[PDB]
Amino acid sequence: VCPNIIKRSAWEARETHCPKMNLPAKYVIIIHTAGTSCTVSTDCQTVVRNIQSFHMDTRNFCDIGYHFLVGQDGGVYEGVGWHIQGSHTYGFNDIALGIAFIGYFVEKPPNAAALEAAQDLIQCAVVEGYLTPNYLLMGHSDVVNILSPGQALYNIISTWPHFKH
Ligand code: NI
């Protein structure tokens, strides 16, 4: 089933009212925050909260851009959740679940804990119906010109199921 998942309230997320996400989604997009990483609950909560603020105040997004985030503490963090539209990839925000690893992974990849959490989340997504049974998995850089989710992480997710080979 779905891994733990720490809620928005847990990281003192600014409350908003954003466009709704249309489920089921047809894709999963692996992203990396490209910023600092985190190894313990409190640190990750902080980093996630800062990203929301940055996305809302200087990027003008309606809320944090990712549906979910994954830390090196192996924990899954709720972004805007399953039901809100994302702000992570042009042309895919209404049909793709954006999952972002907290950190910068071009050279070194996320630990096994982080990776496992992602796949378990992905698994419950398709099982729960948040994703179509024939959904497609892809990396950020496959869709737009972006240095995400990092070659290291890319090489990893490229081997997961439903990856758009
Ligand atoms: Ni599970």
Q: Residue 55, annotated ligand binder?
A: yes
CATH number of the structural domain spanning residue 2: 3.40.80.10
Terminal Cα-to-Cα distance of the chain (whole angstroms): 26
The amino acid present at 142, given as its one-letter code, is D
Cα 154 to Cα 17: distance, rounded to the nearest angstrom: 33
> How far is it, in rounded angstroms, from Cα 66 to Cα 91?
14
**Residue 59 counted as an annotated binding residue:** yes
What is the spatial distance between Cα 43 and Cα 165, in angstroms, rounded to a whole number? 35
| Ligand-binding site membership of 27 (annotated) | no
Report CA(107)–ligand 1 centroid distance (Å). 29
Instruction: For the sheet with 131-139, list strands across it.
Output: 76-78, 68-70, 96-101, 25-32, 131-139
Question: What is the dihedral angle through the alpha carbons of 78, 133, 116, 76, rounded to the nearest 10 degrees?
Answer: 0
Burial 50-73 (b: 16+ CB within 10 A, else e): ebbeebbeeeebbbbbbbbbbbbb
CA distance 74 to 116: 8
Domain residue limits at 62: 1-165
How far is it, in rounded angstroms, from Cα 96 to Cα 164?
Answer: 14
Task: Please count the structural domains in the chain.
Answer: 1
